[PDB]
Amino acid sequence: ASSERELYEAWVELLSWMREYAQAKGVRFEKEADFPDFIYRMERPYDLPTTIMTASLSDGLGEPFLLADVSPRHAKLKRIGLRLPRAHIHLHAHYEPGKGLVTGKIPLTKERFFALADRAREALAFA
Amino acid sequence: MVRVKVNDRIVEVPPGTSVMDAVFHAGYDVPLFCSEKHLSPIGACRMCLVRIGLPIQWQPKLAASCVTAVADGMVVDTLSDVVREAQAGMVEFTLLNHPLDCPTCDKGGACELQDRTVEYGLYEKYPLELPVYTRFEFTRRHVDKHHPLSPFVILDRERCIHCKRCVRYFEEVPGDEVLDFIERGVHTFIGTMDFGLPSGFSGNITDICPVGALLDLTARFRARNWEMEETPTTCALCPV
Amino acid sequence: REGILFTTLEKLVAWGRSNSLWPATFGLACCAIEMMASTDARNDLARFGASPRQADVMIVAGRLSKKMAPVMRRVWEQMPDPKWVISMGACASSGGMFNNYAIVQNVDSVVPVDVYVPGCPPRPEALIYAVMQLQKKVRGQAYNERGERLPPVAAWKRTRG
Amino acid sequence: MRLERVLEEARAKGYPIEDNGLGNLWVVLPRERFKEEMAHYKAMGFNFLADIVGLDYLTYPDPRPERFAVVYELVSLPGWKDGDGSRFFVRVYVPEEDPRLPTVTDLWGSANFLEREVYDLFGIVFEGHPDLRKILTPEDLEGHPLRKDYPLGETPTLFREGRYIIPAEFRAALTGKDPGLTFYKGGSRKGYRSLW
Amino acid sequence: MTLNVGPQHPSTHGVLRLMVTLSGEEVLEVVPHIGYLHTGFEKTMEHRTYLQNITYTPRMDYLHSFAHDLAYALAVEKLLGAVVPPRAETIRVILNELSRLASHLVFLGTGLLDLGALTPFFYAFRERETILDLFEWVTGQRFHHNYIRIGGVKEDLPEEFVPELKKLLEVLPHRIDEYEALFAESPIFYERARGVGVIPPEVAIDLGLTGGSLRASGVNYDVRKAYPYSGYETYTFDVPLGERGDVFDRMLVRIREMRESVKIIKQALERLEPGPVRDPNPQITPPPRHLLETSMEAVIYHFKHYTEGFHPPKGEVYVPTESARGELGYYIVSDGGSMPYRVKVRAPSFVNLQSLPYACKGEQVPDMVAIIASLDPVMGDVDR
Amino acid sequence: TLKALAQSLGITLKYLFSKPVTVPYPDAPVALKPRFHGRHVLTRHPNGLEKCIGCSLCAAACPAYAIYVEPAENDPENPVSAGERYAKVYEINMLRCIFCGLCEEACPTGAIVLGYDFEMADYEYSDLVYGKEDMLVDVVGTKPQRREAKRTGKPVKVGYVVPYVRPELEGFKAPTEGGK
Amino acid sequence: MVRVGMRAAPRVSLEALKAALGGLKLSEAKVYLITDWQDKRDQARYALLLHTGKKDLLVPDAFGPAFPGGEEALSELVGLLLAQGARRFYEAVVSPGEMTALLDLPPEELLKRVMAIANPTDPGIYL
Ligand code: SF4
Ligand code: SF4
């Protein structure tokens, strides 16, 4: 559906949350990758709310403890995922209309994410 | 010497020969990622796959020519419709999760992936049919990108095709396992818990990498491979 | 007397020349055919002579072969003095797309260039721009990128010899 | 029909026959039989002499019999007396250390300028020519430009602050004997052909 | 009097140098001297991609350039075994013939001026301008258009090209006739050109004068007919001819060629329906620009194609084509490299010239000018 | 054939009394076709981000070798282009340039795209090697044009008009048609 | 081929050249000026290769305004070629990087490269 659009908007949202946890703890955030379908989009039109495909939270050493990504505008079975490096931890965010952003049947709130990020920093982050 | 015939031509070739080398020795060719000069072949990237006969008696499944020994009076097929189809296939599996960086990639003009892909890839299916480059229409593997491993060495985990070349190298040649794969399946990636990239030999992996995963930081973003004037010389820094 | 030394008189003659600028074409390649278009639209210029003797402006239009250089040399020398050189197109101006044994890699080697006109071939209206350049150049109305005012005649600046 | 009479003649006398499936055909005569055989060729009804094309194979990846090879193009005009439309190449290899070859000037006056060009650009001297004068390359040019051992003669293309490009050090494109930028080249980049 | 008609002066056209061995008002023998335009493509092009060369192909015969484009494109396609789409082929015949009308328009413009007088250069120039506007419309360039591709052609035709080709296809029949009107009934020209310029067919054949200055002396050979290529095999096609080769007949033959060319333009214009425009084989043709933002294979192939280019099989190849100056064709030796091993260009204008010491032998001096213009050389093709 | 002299004159007469043909550049602006090959332009995305990711494939595509691109790494805080890479130097020697547009055609991001300007004739060789900051979509004029327009303070008028600008030039403002 | 002079030292090189030419008549000689950079003669350096036809002579890059009092040296050089009746002057353009390597090559090779790249030039620009 046009759920796609609300998904990209929500993706922008999640990025915002990453940036915040980043400043809060004095621990590095990084924009990893932009959209090929924007970069290599030439004259072609681009309506997406941002141009950004991949991001992360890195420790002092720059090794990431948290990773986050959204599907390109043109891919089938669109998802946004989360991955914890080294920990074999994979999470899949969908979007149910009216409810909000969900992992399967479980609502994904900002809070849930901040807790996951702190556990991540304290466990995984080397410095 | 052991008598081998590759495609339309015949070669003398010493007994312990890799089928790949008997191939190339006959003046032919075959995709090559995991295996490396001075490195253990392990049929890993599975690029070098060819056909072998031993009497006309063809073996059932394909030999990785890199990890196959050669036997006396042996036949090797590299141009068959089925072989080229298979080669194209492995190439497509490799290209399956890749990042899309060529214009912006430092591995630039000379990438074993780029060149192997353009050599052997997209086998001819049968007119001016309008064909598709890409079948897979799902989301790619996205990981950590542009990560400095040492003041001299940079890491893109997305580009890595999981040949064994760098880790293999570290254990075999210098003997410092400061690099190895981490998780498994498609999730697998290069990382280190020895942070400096300690070895005084660390920069060679930059040369070995068939792709741009491992690049040379001192020369990052300077010019494209073709664009340099390249001056072959000898290093006067020490007596070797 | 070269058009000089009364503020009224020199300006007067200098217009005379700029607006009179009398092209003597020196065709070489496809560029010459792109100047034969310029012949159509033209209105201080396109009467010729054609004979070199009779003209101020030399238009080098085309690839100038190395064997061809000493020729163009004398044609330029065999022009009356208050004379200007326009260099037309890439082959003339620099070595162009033919970078090699055959062709002069800048015509400025053999004849003093006044004005350069890029393109392969340049549109004719660009050559009008160049003769307006050279028009306004000999009026002493012309400047480079460094801030400097440009002399009416280049080849008032080379040592002949 | 006059072409068949050429091939049938070449097979008996042991003349090798080259063929590409593009529709182009060659006949290589030895040096000896060349002058006379080709005299016989004009005599055979060959109106028109199209080309003399000089070839320097020095840098060609595979070896050939001799370094330079010349190809003449003989034809019989289709709209003339009885024209087949029979056109074909006759190739003659020539030694590096012996750039000799008889002119067909007597036969065709076409042979006049073309053989001179092949003299200018390659060192090849054509016997019996009315006038072998240098044709194309500047009077005081030394040597023979289009033979491979002779520099293309590039000059750097020029930019702003100490910035240059040396084309031959800039070139992305590879020749036949070029390795390429990886460990080797296979496949399409060792040569490719689509199958119709 | 060995009179020395110089390199560029006095109006010996296109930078030729002529040693007219001449006592009196006749002409003994002209000893021709060329080489003044020698750019050295055959070497330069050994240093360019097969794609890169397509920028160097139009540049030799700059009047009928697309005949270069066509010949080279074809010889390579053949050599690498590529399949050219029908609409591309049709467009290539249209452009070839339109470029021919351009070239011819030029030839007779200069001819009429060269001896005789000034006026009709301008009308030919007007029609040529409509043609050049057509070329600019489709290729973005006046000439040297980088359009034809080894697959096919660079991109498709815009909306506005069709309407404008018709306009000129409408005026031209009346128009070509107007040029003809002045000429065929030649007032002075008849007593100027009819006698001068002797061409025996046998010597034309002996010296190898192929280029449509051949049919003016009564030999019937056209490459579009004798050795058909781009589907000229399939057109309603008239080949004009001359009686005894003089200046006059050559001169009118090409004018007839212009209406027949226009008839080919109309004919091909009729047969044109929507489709794709170049051979999709990625080895041959760089990927579609839109999917550079999606496919891995796309990006790889884009990068590779525009840097290295492609490698045709080891082989030699040649294909013959018809320009407005005669037999044209590229002899391409490929070594399986990204750049041709060697490209020798069969230059029609170069072989056509062996018959000028013959042609203007015994002719007048004022006529020795006219007899040159009548032979229609282009020096870029000659020196080269 | 005596009659011809007469008819010859006649047609010319017809043509004298027919007045019209020609365009008086620069006083009347030349009409250009939309695909014409002009002064190179670098283009930007809606974001304002430059299309140029500085990959120098325009330069590799170049038969005249007229394009020099020194590459560079994007600054996370304040970015230039959409990748991690952009063009630190873009020089084009107009004098070296043959005007194919193989650069544009090679260009992966639709960065390098030939423009509409032809009034670039200039007095000095090295003034003719254009840099990036002479080529961006925002710029209106050629070098001598702009320089005259500053030393005069009289604004630039280009001597051309087009029916419209191509999709690939998006952002490039030009005098068009009666669109204005 | 002989090689005289040394890089970047105008007056010594000029005095030595004056010594070496002698009563040699130059009417059939060809004079090649080797330089980097077509446009800017103001900061230019110049090396010279003289092909007399009966023997060749190399001078490194010691000439031009690039070095102090160098301009007057190049000017007197060309003047002196002109006096002995040299006529045919040529200009050769090399990369700056080339210039050192070029003159360390063997005589024959260097000379063929020079004749291949050299552009006919007006002697007057060096006066
Ligand atoms: S690793 Fe090779 S294929 Fe991948 S982006 Fe870099 S150059 Fe392209
Ligand atoms: S980083 Fe490179 S060398 Fe190491 S396994 Fe990955 S692809 Fe092979």
Ligand code: SF4
């Ligand atoms: S600049 Fe272009 S149009 Fe002019 S002579 Fe050179 S190739 Fe021909």
Ligand code: SF4
């Ligand atoms: S138009 Fe052609 S010559 Fe000019 S920069 Fe582009 S590729 Fe090079």
Ligand code: SF4
């Ligand atoms: S203009 Fe295009 S081709 Fe050139 S460097 Fe920029 S993105 Fe790459």
Ligand code: FES
């Ligand atoms: S090359 Fe043999 S499997 Fe990697």
